[PDB]
Amino acid sequence: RRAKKEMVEANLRLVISIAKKYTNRGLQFLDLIQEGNIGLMKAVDKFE
DNA sequence: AGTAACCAATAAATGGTATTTAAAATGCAAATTATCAGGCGTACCCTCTTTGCGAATTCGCGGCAGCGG
């Protein structure tokens, strides 16, 4: 657990970029960001 | 080119009380097809950056605030 936190906290900027590419008047910025963070947690789980 | 209402008679005058008839039709609940609605996955590399620009030169008033003897 304490290992995965490090990658998750490292790649938040990546999430920000991908999200802002979709922000143009959808839900709201922060909702997109948080949903992307869910996705990032999934990806960290699946990466080899 | 013929009177009767005499007293029986005849069943026809009804519109009313029902267990039937089974055929129909009318509904009823299954089988059995189509199609819709969810979940998962994607391996070159990409890393705070977008915003609101201002419910828009109001104004007058009040009061709850920080500095200050």
Nucleotide nearest to A13 (CA to C1'): B47
- Alpha carbon of A36 to those of A11, A39: distances in Å? 11, 5
Q: How was this structure determined?
A: cryo-EM
Long-range contacts of A29-38 (CB under 8 A, 24+ apart): A37/A8, A37/A12
Distance, Å, A29 CA → B60 C1':
39
Resolution in A: 3.2
Strand B nucleotides, any atom under 7 Å to a protein CB = 42-43, 46-51
Strand, helix or coil for residue A19: helix
